[PDB]
Write a protein that binds this ligand. Structure first.
Ligand code: K
Ligand code: K
Ligand code: K
Lengths: 198, 198, 198
């Protein structure tokens, strides 16, 4: 009718929070490390230490460990909890927790509001996703190319345009450019969504 | 009056988010490991590895550790962050962070939207809670029996019907059936609420 | 016009959740350990074990570690995830992830609803913040004095009244009183906000 009652607001809020709590976007993530996914270390850009100027000019904390490629499969995305590689090109290969037909990926970066100077120049920009249908993964099939938009929302999801029904258990994230940081690109979290067996 | 103003929506939203941030439900958890609770390892079903078909058929990651019973006392409930035991019956015994009179427990499971095929057949179903008033815990008193509803909300709270005023520092969660998974039952997080001393 | 439409509620809710997800308050934290900050161990009150009465009267779990001063630079603030020192006075010195001009700090404590008896008597109360412009930090300049209000919201932010433009990379949090706990004061998370270089 006219406007909205206090009661329907409560319902809209409760539902929005329930969606928020389903890993924000409500899609199963077959790349999530705790769900059984892993990175193929041997098939990943070399890790770049972003905290150099502090690891030298102040020390190596005793509990301190470099952010490795598995970090992209981990949901903590507080500032710094990103895997960094050198320069604007890099890739990681992920073995998914199940064989799936892939329909979408998600990439997120730390929000501008939480970065120095509100810029995120080390965020990835253009990237592509490849599926490897065999384990002895030499030949990649392009599943899609996309751009992470630095003026968009921190979490962005990308739907493959008309996928085949091919299924895959190993996928690569291949970063083609960044948002212009001259030293490295930082990846906060990469997710892979699709349809499993049965 | 007629409808709701932009201003009262902001207030409803702010309050809902403040409640959301108080561990979702706003009740102290005496089973929370970081608050000083622990599991009595010796008094727990044997742990079942759910990631077998991958731990074999791909490898044992080097950082990898089996999900043990303490995981049920830990708030991270991303997919996979659950303690699994074999078959549909299992139990864990928890030593609470303080001696309390118990009034409710909470059990949660990963949401359907985040599971393969939107089913959660390994969620617990019927279960019971027992208090042990002594440390040399051989004899359990039934505090209540309940069913975790797989079509309900991911977090469910269960109030004991008219508790005595008996106080306890050791409680058991005893799972009686699951939602029909033929190999194991997975527990994401178990909480115990009640009234302390003073 | 008259009231608010279902549609504008959805928009208000979506925005509130996006703000919620930017570390709740939307300001970069230069004290965040994962962002490259650290505590100067050597310049910190001695750590106090709050779980004594259980670490003795039940045991030392095998995975168990005392909550150390770095915990105040870590975003997990579930109950127990606080650094405790003895009595109501204490301090920690933080080396920030970048040299900044400081404009605000944030201090938070666990919410009353999640504590035994709804009281948080171990929360800090009056405190001060000092900047040390040199590394060989002997002389502190008072940046501001404030009170954490135990009847206020769990997260509280404090703006310095007309800061100089002086920049700092090392700051101290100095707690002057607590809310009356006779044995210790517990710090959940301390954040430092300000303007960086460029
Ligand atoms: K991450
Ligand atoms: K858990
Ligand atoms: K903390």
């Amino acid at each position: 009718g006219p406007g909205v009652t206090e009661e329907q607001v409560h319902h809209i809020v409760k539902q929005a929070l329930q969606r928020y709590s389903e890993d924000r976007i409500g899609l199963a993530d077959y790349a999530l490390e705790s769900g059984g996914a892993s990175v193929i270390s041997t098939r990943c850009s070399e890790t770049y230490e972003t905290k150099t100027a502090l690891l030298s000019l102040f020390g190596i904390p005793l509990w301190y460990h470099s952010q490795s490629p598995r970090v992209i499969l981990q949901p903590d995305v507080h500032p710094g909890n990103c895997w960094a590689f050198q320069g604007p090109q890099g890739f990681a290969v992920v073995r998914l927790s199940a064989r799936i037909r892939p329909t979408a990926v998600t990439l997120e970066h730390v929000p501008k509001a939480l970065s120095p100077n509100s810029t995120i120049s080390s965020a990835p920009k253009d990237f592509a996703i490849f599926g490897f249908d065999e384990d002895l993964q030499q030949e990649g099939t392009l599943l899609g190319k996309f751009t992470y938009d630095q003026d968009g929302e921190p979490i962005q999801t990308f739907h493959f345009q008309a996928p085949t029904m091919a299924t895959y258990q190993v996928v690569e994230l291949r970063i083609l450019t960044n948002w212009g940081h001259p030293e490295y690109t930082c990846i906060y979290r990469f997710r892979v969504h699709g349809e499993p067996a049965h």
